Amino acid sequence: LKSRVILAMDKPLSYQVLKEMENELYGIKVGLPLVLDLGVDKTRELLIGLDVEEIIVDFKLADIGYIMKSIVERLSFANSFIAHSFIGVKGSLDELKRYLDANSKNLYLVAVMSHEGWSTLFADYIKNVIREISPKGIVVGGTKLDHITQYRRDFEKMTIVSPGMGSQGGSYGDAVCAGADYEIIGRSIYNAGNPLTALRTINKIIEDKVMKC
Amino acid sequence: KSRVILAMDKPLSYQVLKEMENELYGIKVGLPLVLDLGVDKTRELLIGLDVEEIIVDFKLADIGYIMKSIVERLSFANSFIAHSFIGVKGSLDELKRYLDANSKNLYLVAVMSHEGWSTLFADYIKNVIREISPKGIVVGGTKLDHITQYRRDFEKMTIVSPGMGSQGGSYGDAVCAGADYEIIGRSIYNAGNPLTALRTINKIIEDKVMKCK
Numbered sequence: 001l002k003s004r005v006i007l008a009m010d011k012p013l014s015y016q017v018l019k020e021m022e023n024e025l026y027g028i029k030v031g032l033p034l035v036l037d038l039g040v041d042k043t044r045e046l047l048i049g050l051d052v053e054e055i056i057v058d059f060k061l062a063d064i065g066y067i068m069k070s071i072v073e074r075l076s077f078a079n080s081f082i083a084h085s086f087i088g089v090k091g092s093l094d095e096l097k098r099y100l101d102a103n104s105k106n107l108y109l110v111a112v113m114s115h116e117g118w119s120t121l122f123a124d125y126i127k128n129v130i131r132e133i134s135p136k137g138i139v140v141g142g143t144k145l146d147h148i149t150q151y152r153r154d155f156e157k158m159t160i161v162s163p164g165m166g167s168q169g170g171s172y173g174d175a176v177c178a179g180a181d182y183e184i185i186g187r188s189i190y191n192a193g194n195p196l197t198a199l200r201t202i203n204k205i206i207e208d209k210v211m212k213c
Numbered sequence: 214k215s216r217v218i219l220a221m222d223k224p225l226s227y228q229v230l231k232e233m234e235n236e237l238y239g240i241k242v243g244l245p246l247v248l249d250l251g252v253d254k255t256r257e258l259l260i261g262l263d264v265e266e267i268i269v270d271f272k273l274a275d276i277g278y279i280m281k282s283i284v285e286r287l288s289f290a291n292s293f294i295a296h297s298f299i300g301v302k303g304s305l306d307e308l309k310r311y312l313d314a315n316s317k318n319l320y321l322v323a324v325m326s327h328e329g330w331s332t333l334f335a336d337y338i339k340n341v342i343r344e345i346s347p348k349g350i351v352v353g354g355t356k357l358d359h360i361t362q363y364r365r366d367f368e369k370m371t372i373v374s375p376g377m378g379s380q381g382g383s384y385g386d387a388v389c390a391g392a393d394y395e396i397i398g399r400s401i402y403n404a405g406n407p408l409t410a411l412r413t414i415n416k417i418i419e420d421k422v423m424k425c426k
């Protein structure tokens with residue numbers, strides 16, 4: 001089958017390794033630590049040499065609209081961007097969404113985070129923001145499986161991406177089983193002795209889990 | 214003495230900054246700047262400057278591991294801004310610990326300046342701030358009543374307030390409402406003569422402060 005993995009590239013991997021990974025990943029999530037290390041120019045060059053379904057730039061955008069737009073205009077190599085939902089619509093997400101739509105870029109909104117300290121106190125407000133903005137997708141922690149299932153019910157056509165797998169405790173495939181489309185995986189791949197073997201192993205586990213699912 | 218923190222969200226010349234250094238409290242480094250110049254040239258530009266405080270503002274809003282990875286790359290700065298919404302355990306707690314270990318200041322975004330910022334989480338945010346006990350907080354200068362309220366609630370905290378000029382805030386009103394410093398971007402860096410703009414703004418702030426004091 002086809003991979004459900006989005007590589008969280010928060011640290012550089014060699015072109016050699018990434019080249020082999022191309023056809024065994026759904027996408028790559030480009031993180032701020034990576035871009036700070038390589039610079040925008042070299043980040044773009046790196047990705048140009050790669051062929052994956054989706055390149056997602058994730059700077060966890062959470063500012064006024066002007067600043068979020070200023071950031072994304074500098075990163076045209078991405079297909080999609082991640083922003084927070086909690087910042088709200090007027091003068092923040094509305095401006096960003098307008099710009100991204102005008103430039104044929106996708107938006108993902110952070111709905112529920114993976115760490116224990118995240119509050120789900122404001123799900124009604126968060127859902128309204130999401131419903132209002134109408135992003136391509138949302139981020140829902142793979143450590144919060146019940147939230148994944150809840151969000152999939154409340155948003156049937158939404159792309160759901162789920163991080164917190166491996167390092168943070170999520171067992172590979174549980175998020176997809178609970179309703180996510182893709183699982184975001186960072187350290188368990190890029191810090192592995194052999195990141196390629198790590199990816200191939202994970203793809204197997206996910207395949208197995210989904211079937212028992 | 215200046216109460217202005219220059220929001221450097223686009224490059225300005227070393228030439229100009231050197232004249233500005235003695236007429237500013239501090240400089241807030243924005244993400245578009247660092248994307249443009251790269252980290253190493255950002256370092257070079259700013260360490261070569263003499264201001265009281267350099268605050269790196271990438272609106273930190275991730276898990277602890279990632280937020281720490283980000284700030285470790287910009288440790289020349291004195292202070293960092295993070296969102297309070299993301300919560301404590303596994304996020305802000307790890308960041309605060311790391312920042313403390315390195316004698317860095319943390320500012321938490323408490324109330325944002327745009328219209329879409331919800332008052333719904335006011336109590337939750339206050340709790341996070343009490344739990345973390347950061348050096349300062351960010352409270353929108355377009356939200357003067359919130360500044361005053363937050364000043365009463367956290368009399369010992371540094372309050373910095375953006376939204377002055379471009380977003381409609383009148384220079385000095387934020388300080389008069391009880392903020393220590395005002396954050397100002399476009400009104401200065403997009404001015405025909407940024408130096409003149411800053412001097413004009415400093416004059417306006419001084420006049421206002423002398424009246425509200």
Ligand SMILES: O=c1cc(O)n([C@@H]2O[C@H](COP(=O)(O)O)[C@@H](O)[C@H]2O)c(=O)[nH]1
Pocket residue numbers: 008010029031058112113114115139141163164165166167168184185186187188275276279
């Ligand atoms: O709630 C969230 C949202 C995220 O985007 N992420 C991101 O998912 C990735 C997880 O990386 P790791 O597999 O090494 O735990 C990181 O890029 C992180 O910023 C997360 O961990 N939790």
Ligand SMILES: O=c1cc(O)n([C@@H]2O[C@H](COP(=O)(O)O)[C@@H](O)[C@H]2O)c(=O)[nH]1
Pocket residue numbers: 063064067220222241243270322324325326327351353375376377378379380396397398399400
């Ligand atoms: O609620 C907030 C919080 C901010 O940090 N800011 C920051 O304050 C600055 C405002 O710049 P400007 O004066 O050009 O509006 C920007 O760096 C922005 O990211 C804000 O505008 N509103």
